[PDB]
Amino acid sequence: GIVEQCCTSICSLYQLENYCN
Amino acid sequence: FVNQHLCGSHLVEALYLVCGERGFFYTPKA
């Protein structure tokens, strides 16, 4: 999930955008 | 600003800024 991908490891725009509505 | 470790309020803030008037969902447990 988002914590594993963006907190515990380095985030990306590609990944953040997947959580936009 | 998104190409780093983003935790807690910092992650929510990034989602807010990136997603704009779309909004977003923040699901940390899953």
From Swiss-Prot, chain B:
Organism domain of life: Eukaryota
Protein known as: Insulin B chain
Organism: Sus scrofa (Pig)
This protein's encoding gene: INS
From-to range in the entire protein, with total length: 25 to 54 of 108
